[PDB]
Structures are given as C-alpha cells and as structure tokens.
RNA sequence: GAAUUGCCCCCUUCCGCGGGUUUUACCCAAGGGGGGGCGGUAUUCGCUUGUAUCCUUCUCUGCGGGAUUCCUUGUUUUGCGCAAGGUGAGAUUUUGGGCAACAGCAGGUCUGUGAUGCUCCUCAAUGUUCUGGGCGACACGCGCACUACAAUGUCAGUGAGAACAAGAAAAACGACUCUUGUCGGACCUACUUGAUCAAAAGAGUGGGAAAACCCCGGAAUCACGUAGACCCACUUGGGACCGAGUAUUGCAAUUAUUGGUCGCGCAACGAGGAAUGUCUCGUAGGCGCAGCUCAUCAAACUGUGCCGAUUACGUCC
C-alpha cells in the first residue's frame, strides 16, 4: 500500500468541503501533495410500480441515488497523517476510508 | 407520347376534403399568344408542391373546379 | 510475434497453415469425428470437415492477443441456438476442443503455456501470400 | 418426367458446349429455364467451360456469379 | 513531427496519429488499408484521401485506434480521424494558405468535414417498447 | 448411364436425391446419424444417389446400420440405449419403430402408471398445458 | 491525380450524363460520390429528399420487410451485380438507363376523391414531379420482389429486367402496366 | 532483445522527323537533350519483451461557458411575429423525461402496513399450524386477449473463417480460530486440470468489496476473390407431438423442472376474409446483452447498445 485517503458521500457540496479545502494541511502547507482526484459517479436506480393495487394504466416511478467518490494520495508522511485527516470530520454521510 | 409541361407561377390554396390534394396556378408554355391563349389557368395537383417546379399535362381546357 | 494481423488474414492466411499442418504430420488429429462445437444442425456433422480449418486459429489468435487460452477462445466461436422450441435465441459455444487442439499444437506453435510462439511459422507462410499459392488456375 | 435433373448425359454436355457460350448473358439460373438440369450442377458445369475458355467471367462472387461470352 | 486528432460517430471514438515517413503508407489498427474485408466500408475510408488529391498531399504515415461501436460506425469514425489529421498537420507545419485549400475540397464534397454528428439514440420509456411504439390492447 | 428412380434400402422406396445422407432420412434415419459415411465404406459426399451396387455398393451402408458395434462402438448415438426388458440394444429401424414404440405404450397401459393413463385418452403426457392449445 | 476529379460508381462514369425529361430534371439528382452509402437527415425538412443521389434512392428503396434482413450493406452488394447485368445486356452505361427508366415508370395523372353521399365520385387530378419520381422507384422495386419469390432462381437478375423493360417502354415490366391502368382510370373518370 | 526479410520510380519542358495538314499555322507516333522531385533527422512488426525519459489529444468528474442573435431592409402595421438563407457542436418548446390548477367519480384497493369503524369467529377455531398429502393463476370438445416461431433463395439454410457493442450486477447471515475483544469461508469469475478420447458434469489453485479481478468485456445483426454444400420442393423450409439414456439444482423434481445427443418430422403452415392496433428521425422495423423474480426455470417486464429506412410535414371529411 501507500497512504490513500478515499472519501465517499451521498451528495456533492459535501465532498468538496473535505477534499478541495480542508486537506489544506498536507497541500502546500507543510509537505508534498500528489493529488489525483475523482472517479466514476455511480447511479443506483430502483424502478417501482406506482399503483398499490392492480388497477390503472400501468404507471411506474423510477427512483435514483447518486454515489460520489474521491481519492487522493500522500507519499509516506510518518504520522503527520494524524493531523491532516482529523481536522475535517465534517458533514453527515461523508465517510473516510484511509488505507 | 405527347406530354405538355408548364410552370408553377404561384400557389392559390390548399383545398381538398382531407388535405389530399392542393390547388395551384399554372403558366402554360404551349401558349403561342394566338390559337393557344390561356395566360394563367388553374389545375388540381396531388402530392407536395413548391413554386418553380414543373408539371406534366396531357389535358387542358379543364379548370380546377368546373361547374361540376 | 505478428501472428494474425500481418498480411491479409482472411481465408487465405488460414488455408496455407492448414496445408502446412498436413504433409509432414506433426500434430494429433484425434478420434472423435462426431463432435459438434457449433450446434443447431439436423444435417451431417461438418460439411467442410471441422478439424481442417480449426487448428491454425488456436495458435494464431493465442499469439495475437497473447495468453488467450481455453475458455477465452470460445468467445470467437459462434451460434444462435437457431432451432429452439418456439423460444427466442442465445449465443452458446462448446469449449472442449480448444484444449485438445492446444495440446495437438504444442509440438509446433505454442512455445510454452507461460509465453507463446517460436520464430513464428506463420510469419513465414504469411509472407508468401504476396507471392505464391499452392496452385494458380482460372478463378484464383 | 424430369423437370430438373441430376444427370450426366449426352444431351446435357452436348447442348452445354454449343448453345451456352453463344449467349450474351450466362447465369447458372437460365440453363434451368431450359427444363433440363438444376441451377445446382449448372454452376460447377460452367466453371469447366470457363477453365477451357469457352466462356469468360465478369464477377467473382458468392451465390451471385455470372459469366459472359468469351 | 506529429499531431494527433480524433473522429467520432455514435458511441465510437477513434483516435489517430500523423507522423512523417514520406515514402510509407497508412494502416488502421494493424491491418493495412487495402485489405479491409467489406468492400463498401473499404471504399468509404479511401474517400478522405481521394478527395484532396492522392499521395500528392499525403504520403505521410497514419494509424488509428477505433473503440466502441459496430462495423459501419467504425468506418465513418475513421474517415473523420484521417481528414482531421491531414488538416491539423498542415496548420502547424505549413502556411494558412494551402491548409484552407484542402478545407474547401472537403466541405464541397458530401463528407462535410466536421460531421461530428449529434445523433445518438433516445431512451426507452415505461409506457412503451422503446420510444414511440406504446402497447396494443383491444377495444380502443 | 442409367439413373436411379425409386431405389430401395429396406424394401421401401427411396428418392434418388443427389446428395447421399438426405436420401437415407426416409429410412429413419436423420442427418446426425449418417455422417458416419467414413466408417460405412463408401466415404462419398457430393455424389448422386444412383451410384449403388457398383463399387460404392449398397449393402456396405446397410450392414453398418444393422450392427454398429464393429464399425465403431460409441453409444450416445443410438435410438435405444439400456432397454428396460433386455440389457442393452442399439436399435436402428424401421421396421420396428411402430412395433417397439407400441410395446412401451402397451406396457404402461396394463399396470396403469400415470404416463400410460394420460396417453390412452390422447391427452398430452409430458409437462404441457391444455385449454388454449392444442385444439384440433 | 486520377482521384481528385474522378468519381466513379465502381468504374461507371457520371461525366457525360443527361435526363431526357425537363420535368424531372431537378428531382432526379446527379450522383458524384463513389458508393451509395451515406448518413441521413434528408427527412429533416420538407424538400431535401431529392438532393440525394439516385443510386441511394435505389438501394434504400429495395429494402423492405423483416425476414432476417441485413439492410444497408446487403442492398448495395445486389445493386452492384444488377448494374453489371444491364451493362452487358443492352451494351450501354448502366447509370444512363436508370435515369430514364425512372421517368417513364410512373403516371402523369391520377384519380382521387372529392366524392360524398356515402359513395365516391372521382375526378382526374395531375401529379406533381416529386410524386412521379418516388412512385417509379417503388413500383420497379416491387416488381423485382414479386418476380424473385419462387420464380427464376436468380438473386439480382429480375431487378435489371424491370429497369430495362421500363426505359424502352415495354409492357413486360411491372411499372409500365401500373402506369397504363392508372391513366385508363383517371382520364375516363372525367 | 526477438521476428519477417520483401514493393504481384514519377513529373514538367524543348528540339527533330514520318504520317494526319489547305501552302501555312495546328496535331499524333517515335527518339534525343535540358530542368525539378526523391528514398530525406524513417524497411516493418510484438496489450507478457523488456530498459530509461517525458506528456495529457483520446478517459474520468465537480463547478462553469454556449444563440429569434445576424441577414434577406422579403413578409408583417411602426407592432406580436412568420418564411427562406447565413452563423454554428447545436436553429427553434435544441432533443427526451420528471413535475402539474379548479371542480369532481358513490372508479380500484379492507390480498401492502401495529391504517382502520361496525360486525363475524374464538380451545374439537375461520386463530396459530413454516405438520403430512392435494389443489392454486395447471385439471379439458369450445370462444376471446397478449406473446413468440414460421411458411425460406432480398442471410436463405445446417458449414467455415474475419471484425465487433454499453448501461448493469457481486460482500454478510452468533458457527469457526483469533486475543481480549476479532480472522477466514457461505457471492462472482479466471486460469489449470479433468482430456492417452462426447456433451453435460467433476476437481485443485488464484484474483476482485468493483474504473484494479472478470476485462483489451473478442455479442448478434454483419461481412467472404470462402471456386463450400443445397435448388424451388411442404425439400436439406418448419418443427408440434412422441420414446429411450444421462447429469446437475433441492429436505422433497412422479402430473416428464432444468440442461445436454440419438430416433420421431410422411404434425401443422405456401403470405393470409370482414375488421383492427401505434407510429414523423437515430424514428419505424430487424438483432442481441444485462438487470428484475431467485435452490432451480422468462416467449414477460425494466434498462442499455448495434444495424437503420419509406411517406407526409396537411386537413377536418
């Protein structure tokens, strides 16, 4: 492995606060940053009939979720990673998968 | 076979009973100013029409409504 | 390596290797004449004889895209499952022959399982398609 | 009797090598119009006239083949 | 000296490259352009070279990589990629004069050079068997 | 010289079709049997039916249909394998297609097993549905 | 060059080419492309579908029905053989034939309905140029399809037969009958 | 480093002479001379064939750019606008969706719900019953609705070879071994073997929690200068029914569950009456794949892609 921080979320304008600002700490602030960035957004798509009984003209609804995914890289910091990560914990339903 | 032509100088109306046909206004070109004198006539035509197109007539002395 | 994708690579470039594979026999042409890998028939098993054009492909292709082996190869098999029981239609392919072919090509063709191709027999029989056939007459 | 035939025969190969190479357009089909032989063995038949150059070719084709006079 | 370009048609994107060898000739994929088995498609891909002279404007060496649609669409993609390349190479390594000339001959012809083509395909919808067919049922 | 017209291969008339396997279909007999022409001692294809009992002789073919366990021995290729009144059989007929069949029918009829009940009434005996098709 | 000005069907020449009728001169195009396969978008506006080369109005006009149909590429390949037949038959360039066989393939007068009263009454009504073109294409192609169903065995041939028997004025073709009957109706509904 | 080891030159110009020339001018054949291209800092080829260096055209994605403008001075009333052309990636609701007022129907649903009023039933129950067996949209002269496959020679049918698509799908279930509070396996798929002899099956190993594995996603339609078979016949067109053998799924496949090869085809059906369905451009039609349901089985439904037209762009009958 290397140090790979991934960020996943259910909406945009959530990810951007975490990534695109508040990984500031590793950016130009103290140490090197190699920044790759963002990945295929996936769609989770659940088609569902609209009538609670059997009648009608056979209408439907389609519902959707969006996933959002991000990814950034650091070249062996030796427990500066503690600092860098911990400052943004922010926004409900953003999760942070550090490797 | 005798095939007389003529030019579509303008259009008049689109007049049919389902839009099937259309009226148009013809300048004969077999007009010689003397034993053919027609000036401008009108005929019924069929399918899409546009000014400056030419059409083919094997008959003349029939107007596009008559008295019938 | 250059196998399949050199000069032509239609029928012309397969006929010459088949011709080669005969003559000096160096390759198994195992019993089982009865075997249908592309299906659908109510008629005799293969008209042009299945074994005859089958052999070249399973070194050619395998050294073109390199380490395409066993179940990879069935993908360029064909079929519709044309007669079905007033059902629609599918793809299908029967895989087995590829394995016994690649064994009967392991005398000349495949260098190893791990890497593939010798000095390329068909880089040679390929290069005489510009030049010579085995005959020329009226409609070639 | 035989609307179309399988036969190798006298009159087959006779009529072939006289009437056929004279014709301006030659197809395997039109020999079957003479109520004589198929459009099957016709094809192959023509190919050994064309070898001996009684007739000439116009297109290399598959199923669609034709020939002309030499 | 190089340039790169892309032609496109439907989903299929085809990339391309132009480099100078001025006694050498054009291929697509690995197969050379004279050998590309459907006759009609073969014709089409040549019309980027027959329009705009011969080897007079283009004895350069060109190779393309087509990805992502079936045979027909691959053809049209190719044409665009070739022609784009020719143009672009002229712009960079030569004057604006002779460049503009090439353009006039393309656009004249029925190719219409920048035929990028916005048509794709519109979606299946819930009340239909795809995009304006609906369903059939009795007693309307 | 002389062409075919109404040959026999069972004392049963057989068209002189100009490819060999397709004539034999009449004898029942179907395409993915015949292609044993290799082992049948006339290896011919692309050859008329009319050339019989010459040096592409008739009883060659005929014998290989009678006993196919000496011209090569695979099953999965035989009408009846593992008979349920004898140990094993090969079976390639007529004449016994309308006898052997009929006997299976009769057997089931007797002891009244379900397959045999349904077939006396002429109803479908496999999976099958009725009440919309088949309608006579 | 021998490329830049030359445009040929596969060797057949557009260089000296005429339409015998002034009526359908501008509604029968002049081909100037190699092969009869092209994009679309000529049905995107009311008149643009007669600025398209005539060999495509043949190719596309021969594909109808499902059966397993291979559509475009298929059609082209048959047209090729057809033209070849024509050339050695009448000893004339193919393209010229076609561009005449069109013109005579379709009536100049027609019969339609002004009637009412629960019954019809029909007058004689002339036919615009655009019609005559399209009608001719149609009926020739139809004659082929029918003729080739189980009669002959030939795969192009009866195509060529319609075209040739059209251009000369013969009643052996499909189209020329159609024309005759339609005018023997129209002109006598007056 | 490895491999093939070969192409089954061109342009421009001047002069001469013999023909064709009406003297002449003009023109064709043949030949010679001069000028200019040119093998350019390049024979060609490796998604396992490896060293070094550099880049972001093609990919991915969040937030943003991107036209009733311009002209025809046409048409129109100066107005609202309209038609043709131009500009352009795109030209008029740019294209396809989702959303959608007021007033209602005694439409459907008490078989969606710890959504329910009043009633019925309650210990030999109309409850519970994951209990054993049967029945269920399944049982068979017959009518009707929707679907799929055909009557073949416009790929048309059994055989062969070539190229080639994108949305999408998979991960946790108290048992197990780990220490002191947690690893692995129950889901996909590759390769290899089985295969010194059918399919279907069997077995061992490895990867992937998904833009890493499967995957360079080798779809089918399709293409063929493949000298392929076939030949107009209910035929090798179509299969419906029907018998035998075998393996897998599952606690249980008998009323055949699903595959997979032999026989049955001599069972229908040869373009279809009255009548009738919905469609205007990447559309109609043809063709295939995935998701859905879920031990097992899709001619259905939902979604994505490929091949891709004819006619009209009008009226009120």
TrEMBL record, chain C:
An example molecular function term from Gene Ontology annotations: RNA binding
GO term, biological process aspect, one: translation
GO cellular component, one term: cytosolic small ribosomal subunit
Keywords, comma-separated and alphabetical: Ribonucleoprotein, Ribosomal protein
Family: Belongs to the eukaryotic ribosomal protein eS19 family.
Protein name: Ribosomal protein S19, putative
Source organism: Trypanosoma cruzi (strain CL Brener)
Residues of the full protein shown: 12 to 151 of 167
UniProtKB/TrEMBL annotation, chain E:
GO CC entries: cytosolic small ribosomal subunit
One example GO MF annotation: RNA binding
Keywords: Ribonucleoprotein, Ribosomal protein
One Pfam family per UniProt: Ribosomal_S9
GO BP, sorted A to Z: maturation of SSU-rRNA from tricistronic rRNA transcript (SSU-rRNA, 5.8S rRNA, LSU-rRNA); translation
InterPro entries: Ribosomal_Su5_D2-typ_SF (IPR020568), Ribosomal_uS9 (IPR000754), Ribsml_uS5_D2-typ_fold_subgr (IPR014721)
Family assignment from sequence similarity: Belongs to the universal ribosomal protein uS9 family.
Name of protein: 40S ribosomal protein S16, putative
Organism, scientific name: Trypanosoma cruzi (strain CL Brener)
Automatic annotation (TrEMBL), chain F:
Example of a GO MF term: RNA binding
Primary localization class, coarse: cytoplasm
Top-level division of the source organism's lineage: Eukaryota
Keyword Ribosomal protein assigned: yes
Keyword Cytoplasm: yes
GO cellular component: cytosol; small ribosomal subunit
GO biological process: translation
Pfam family, one: Ribosomal_S13
Record's keyword terms, sorted: Cytoplasm, Ribonucleoprotein, Ribosomal protein
InterPro entries, sorted: Rbsml_uS13_C (IPR027437), Ribosomal_uS13 (IPR001892), Ribosomal_uS13-like_H2TH (IPR010979), Ribosomal_uS13_CS (IPR018269)
Subcellular location, record wording: Cytoplasm
Family of the protein in this entry: Belongs to the universal ribosomal protein uS13 family.
Protein name: 40S ribosomal protein S18, putative
Taxonomic source organism: Trypanosoma cruzi (strain CL Brener)
Lineage: Eukaryota, Discoba, Euglenozoa, Kinetoplastea, Metakinetoplastina
TrEMBL record, chain G:
Domain Small ribosomal subunit protein uS7: start-end pairs: 27-190
Any one GO molecular function term: RNA binding
GO cellular component, one term: small ribosomal subunit
GO BP, sorted A to Z: translation
Pfam family, one: Ribosomal_S7
Keyword annotations from UniProtKB, A to Z: Ribonucleoprotein, Ribosomal protein
Family recorded in the similarity comment: Belongs to the universal ribosomal protein uS7 family.
PANTHER family: RIBOSOMAL PROTEIN S7 (PTHR11205)
Name the record gives this protein: 40S ribosomal protein S5, putative
């Amino acid at each position: 492995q290397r140090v790979l921080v991934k960020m996943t979320s259910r909406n945009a304008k959530a990810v951007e606060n975490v990534m695109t600002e508040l990984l500031l700490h590793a950016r130009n602030e103290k140490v090197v940053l190699r920044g790759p960035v963002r990945l295929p957004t996936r769609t989770l798509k659940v088609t569902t009939r609209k009538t609670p009984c059997g009648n009608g003209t056979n209408t439907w609804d389609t519902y959707e979720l969006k996933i959002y995914k991000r990814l950034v890289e650091l070249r062996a910091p030796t427990e500066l990673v503690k600092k860098i990560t911990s400052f943004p914990i922010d926004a409900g339903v953003d999760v942070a998968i550090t490797i | 076979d005798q095939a007389q032509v003529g030019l579509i100088i303008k259009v008049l109306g689109r007049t049919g009973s389902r839009g099937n046909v259309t009226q148009v206004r013809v300048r004969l070109m077999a007009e010689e100013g003397s034993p053919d004198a027609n000036r401008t006539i009108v005929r019924n035509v069929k399918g899409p029409c546009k000014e400056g197109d030419m059409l083919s007539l094997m008959e003349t002395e029939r107007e596009a409504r008559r008295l019938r | 390596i250059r196998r399949i994708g050199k000069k032509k690579g239609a029928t012309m470039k397969d006929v010459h290797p088949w011709r080669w594979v005969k003559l000096c026999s160096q390759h198994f042409k195992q019993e089982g004449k009865l075997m249908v890998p592309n299906c659908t028939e109510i008629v005799k098993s293969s008209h042009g004889r299945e074994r005859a054009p089958q052999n070249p492909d399973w070194y050619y292709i395998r050294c073109a895209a390199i380490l395409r082996a066993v179940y990879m190869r069935p993908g360029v098999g064909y079929g519709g499952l044309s007669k079905r029981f007033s059902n629609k239609k599918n793809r299908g392919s029967r895989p087995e022959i590829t394995v016994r072919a690649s064994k009967g090509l392991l005398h000349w063709g495949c260098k190893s399982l791990t890497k593939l191709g010798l000095i390329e027999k068909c880089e040679s029989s390929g290069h005489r398609i510009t030049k010579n056939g085995r005959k020329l007459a009226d409609a070639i | 009797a035989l609307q179309n035939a399988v036969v190798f025969d006298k009159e087959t190969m006779d009529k072939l090598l006289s009437e056929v190479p004279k014709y301006k357009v030659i197809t395997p089909s039109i020999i079957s119009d003479r109520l004589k032989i198929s459009v099957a063995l016709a094809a192959k038949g023509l190919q050994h006239l064309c070898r001996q150059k009684l007739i000439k070719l116009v297109s290399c084709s598959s199923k669609f083949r034709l020939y002309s006079r030499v | 000296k190089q340039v790169q370009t892309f032609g496109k048609k439907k989903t299929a994107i085809a990339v391309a490259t132009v480099t100078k060898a001025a006694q050498c000739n054009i291929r697509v994929n690995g197969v050379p352009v004279s050998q590309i088995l459907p006759e009609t498609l073969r014709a089409k891909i040549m019309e980027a070279v027959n329009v705009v002279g011969s080897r007079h404007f283009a004895r350069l060496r060109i190779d393309v990589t087509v990805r992502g649609a079936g045979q027909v669409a691959q053809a049209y993609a190719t044409r665009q990629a070739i022609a784009k390349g020719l143009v672009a190479y002229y712009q960079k390594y030569k004057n604006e004069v002779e460049k503009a000339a090439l353009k006039d001959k393309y656009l004249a012809y029925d190719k219409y050079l920048l035929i990028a083509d916005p048509r794709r395909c519109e979606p299946k919808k819930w009340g239909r068997h795809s995009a304006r067919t609906r369903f059939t049922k009795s007693y309307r | 010289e002389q062409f075919q017209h109404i040959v026999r291969l069972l004392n049963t008339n057989v068209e002189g079709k100009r490819k060999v396997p397709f004539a034999l279909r009449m004898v029942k007999g179907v395409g993915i049997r015949f292609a044993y022409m290799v082992c049948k001692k006339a290896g011919i294809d692309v050859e008329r039916r009319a050339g019989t009992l010459t040096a592409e002789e008739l009883e060659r073919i005929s014998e290989v249909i009678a006993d196919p366990a000496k011209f090569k021995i695979p099953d999965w290729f035989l009408n009846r394998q593992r008979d349920p009144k004898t140990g094993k059989t090969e079976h390639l007929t007529s004449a016994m297609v309308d006898t052997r069949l009929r006997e299976d029918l009769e057997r089931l009829r007797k002891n009244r097993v379900h397959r045999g009940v349904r077939h006396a009434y002429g109803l479908r005996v496999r999976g099958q549905h009725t009440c919309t098709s088949g309608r006579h | 060059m021998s490329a830049k000005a030359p445009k040929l069907f596969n060797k057949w020449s557009y260089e000296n080419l005429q339409t015998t009728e002034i009526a359908l001169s501008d509604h029968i195009s002049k081909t100037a492309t190699y092969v009869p396969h092209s994009a679309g978008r000529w049905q995107k506006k009311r008149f643009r579908k007669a600025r398209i080369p005539i060999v495509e109005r043949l190719t596309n006009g021969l594909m109808f029905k499902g059966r397993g149909n291979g559509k475009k590429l298929q059609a082209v390949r048959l047209v090729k053989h057809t033209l070849e037949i024509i050339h050695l038959l009448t000893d004339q360039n193919p393209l010229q034939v076609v561009i005449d066989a069109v013109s005579k393939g379709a009536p100049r007068e027609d019969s339609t309905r002004v009637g009412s009263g629960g019954v019809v009454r029909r007058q004689a009504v002339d036919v615009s140029p655009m019609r005559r073109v399209n009608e001719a294409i149609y009926l020739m192609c139809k004659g082929a399809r029918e003729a080739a169903f189980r009669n002959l065995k030939t795969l192009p041939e009866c195509l060529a037969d319609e075209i040739v028997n059209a251009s000369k004025g013969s009643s052996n073709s499909y189209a020329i009958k159609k024309k005759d009957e339609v005018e023997r109706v129209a002109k006598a509904n007056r």
